[PDB]
């Protein structure tokens, strides 16, 4: 694809240059929010000292604003320079909207089918290595949907662009009870059904 | 809060006095697309899908991080040299897929609520440091401006091998060890 860009961080006003060690941390976050394709796009650039967000530009506002008393000198300075304001406003297109075109061709088309396995522990339905995050898991006892007795872990982010989730069922197995785990995911046209028979 | 279908960080920009060290990375829906190796001047995408089809010039990162260094000095003075507050990290260890002895799997160590972004993550196999088959993410951003980081250990599950994820952070009084073991 074409070379992608990030948000350009505005230059701060300055003209030049215990038991644990000291650390001074600076963070700048160029954040793009997308809703309903690119019909609703919002750019929020955040300027953070340590963990204190002290100034930000918000495309819904159109100018920089101070967040904490640490921010007025920066926000006033950045709002007075046309080379900072107009360039930041343009990033809604040059950064957010353009990069989204490459997300549409890669990240937003990534469909990894979930792996569904059943193992006793409480019956555990492991749904592993799927993407994107939207998933629906249901327990069934002989074509009867279980509503009580189901405990699911939160959605688990593996950090490698896959998710997993464990859905557990407190049950009493008899000789005729057949338990099935039903999983729905955008990578699947039809649900995955895995059976466990006592 | 801001509700949206998709959230991207087209610029997680980090610089800190300890080191000193920095980080430039892009995120989409909470996952890392790439980081820029500032020393080697290379864009390192986190999926082979991304390197084949996407471009990002590392010079954009080097330029932006140099600005962060300038901004940090300016706000250090403005804040009367207010240092970062150490947070207590949270560690969790789990496997990537259901464990079956003899079948290759992956141990995952999630170090959450990291601040400042300075941490040691070490895998122990039967009490000894293991670096073979080890990889990790960069620092991943959080909405409260702390970080999390995930380390991976590829391993062969066996009844005679136990593991620990050793995490060292200034917010901890001593190294934190989260233990993990197979089915039996």
């Amino acid at each position, epitope marked *: 694809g074409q*070379v992608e860009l990030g948000g350009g961080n505005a230059v701060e006003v300055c003209k030049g240059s215990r038991d644990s060690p000291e650390d001074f941390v600076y963070q700048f976050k160029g954040m793009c929010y997308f809703t309903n394709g690119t019909e609703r796009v919002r750019l929020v650039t955040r300027y953070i000292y340590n963990r204190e967000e002290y100034a930000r530009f918000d495309s819904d506002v159109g100018v920089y604003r101070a967040v904490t008393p640490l921010g007025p000198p920066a926000a006033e300075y950045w709002n007075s320079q046309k080379e900072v304001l107009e360039r930041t406003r343009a990033e809604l297109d040059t950064v957010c909207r353009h990069n989204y075109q490459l997300e549409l061709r890669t990240t937003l088309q990534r469909r990894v089918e979930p792996t569904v396995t059943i193992s006793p522990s409480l019956l555990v339905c492991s749904v592993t290595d799927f993407y994107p995050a939207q998933i629906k898991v249901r327990w069934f006892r002989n074509d009867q949907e279980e509503t009580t007795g189901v405990v699911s872990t939160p959605l688990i982010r593996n950090g490698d662009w896959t998710f997993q989730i464990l859905v557990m069922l407190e049950m009493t197995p008899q000789r005729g009870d057949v338990y099935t785990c039903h999983v729905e995911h955008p990578s699947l046209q039809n649900p995955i059904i895995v059976e466990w028979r006592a | 809060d801001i509700v949206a279908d998709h959230v991207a960080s087209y610029g997680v920009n980090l610089y800190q006095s300890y080191g000193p060290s920095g980080q430039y990375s892009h995120e989409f829906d909470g996952d890392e697309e790439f980081y820029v190796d500032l020393e080697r001047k290379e864009t390192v995408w986190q999926l082979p899908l991304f390197r084949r089809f996407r471009r990002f010039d590392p010079q954009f990162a080097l330029t*932006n991080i140099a600005v962060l260094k300038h901004n940090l000095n300016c706000v250090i003075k403005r804040s009367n040299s207010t240092a970062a507050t150490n947070e207590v990290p949270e560690v969790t260890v789990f496997s990537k897929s259901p464990v079956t002895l003899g079948q290759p799997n992956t141990l995952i160590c999630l170090v959450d609520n990291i601040f400042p972004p300075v941490v040691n993550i070490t895998w122990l196999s039967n009490g000894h440091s293991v670096t073979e088959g080890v990889s990790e993410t960069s620092f991943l951003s959080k909405s409260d401006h702390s970080f999390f980081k995930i380390s991976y250990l590829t391993f062969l599950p066996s009844a005679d091998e136990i593991y620990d994820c050793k995490v060292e952070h200034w917010g901890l009084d001593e190294p934190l060890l989260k233990h993990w073991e197979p089915e039996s």
Partner: T-cell receptor, first 115, second 114 residues
Framework: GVTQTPRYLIKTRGQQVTLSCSPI?????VSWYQQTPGQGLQFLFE???????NKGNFPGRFSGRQFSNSRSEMNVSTLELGDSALYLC???????????????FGPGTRLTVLE | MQTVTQSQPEMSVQEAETVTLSCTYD???????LFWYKQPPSRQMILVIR??????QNATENRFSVNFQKAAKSFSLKISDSQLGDTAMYFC???????????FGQGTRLTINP
């Protein structure tokens, strides 16, 4: 505007040279270029906030630096006859990361290297 | 000779007439800037025209204008009402927002005949 000194300079092979540049008032970025008839305009390096942000492909004997008021110097040690060139300084506002696209040049330094 | 191409080493034009200087470029950048510089015999590099990739409106500065064809990657400079003071070396320049290096073409020598 961008000012440079010396405008003209004669040196012999092996000597060193230090060139001075003062950017446009308020500009934070200074870029250095070498113009020869055989290679055209060749980028040396770019300085911002007293540090080198961007580098060309010149050998280590070509070096530069930038001071607290954003004035810049560049240096060429062990001068070669091929180093005879016009050495150009260009300044950019650089009020945000990446905004060095518009560069305004100084008059340049005419350096002649002789045996 | 690869990122910016000026295929005309020398160009001449009659005074008060119009001349067009050719410039094509090759890049993968999505956002970038295109320039023309005028270098008279004084060797002073003068910035004449600036064009932004995301502003498809052709840039104009009085007698100077460009024909920016983004899809063709062409950035020709038109000098209207050529003056004797337009005699100079003209350089086409490219600056990608990612690589952030100002790159110059080989240059085009323009002579205005009185």
């Amino acid at each position: 505007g961008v000012t440079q000194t010396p405008r003209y300079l004669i040196k012999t092979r092996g000597q060193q040279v230090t060139l001075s540049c003062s950017p446009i008032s308020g500009h934070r970025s200074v870029s250095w270029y070498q113009q020869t008839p055989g290679q055209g305009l060749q980028f040396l390096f770019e300085y911002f906030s007293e540090t080198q942000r961007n580098k060309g492909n010149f050998p280590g004997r070509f070096s530069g630096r930038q001071f607290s008021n954003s004035r810049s110097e560049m240096n060429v040690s062990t001068l070669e006859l091929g180093d005879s060139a016009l050495y150009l300084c260009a300044s950019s506002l650089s009020a945000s990361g990446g905004a060095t696209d518009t560069q305004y040049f100084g008059p340049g330094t005419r350096l002649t290297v002789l045996e | 000779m690869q990122t910016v191409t000026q295929s005309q080493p020398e160009m001449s034009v009659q005074e008060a007439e119009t001349v067009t200087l050719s410039c094509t470029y090759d890049t993968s950048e999505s956002n970038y800037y295109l320039f023309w510089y005028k270098q008279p015999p004084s060797r002073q590099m003068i910035l004449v025209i600036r064009q932004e990739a995301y502003k498809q409106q052709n840039a104009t500065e009085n007698r100077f204008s460009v024909n920016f064809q983004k899809a063709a990657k062409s950035f020709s400079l038109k000098i209207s009402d050529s003056q004797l003071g337009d005699t100079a070396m003209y350089f086409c320049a490219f600056f990608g927002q990612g690589a952030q290096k100002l790159v110059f073409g080989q240059g085009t020598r323009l002579t205005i005949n009185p």
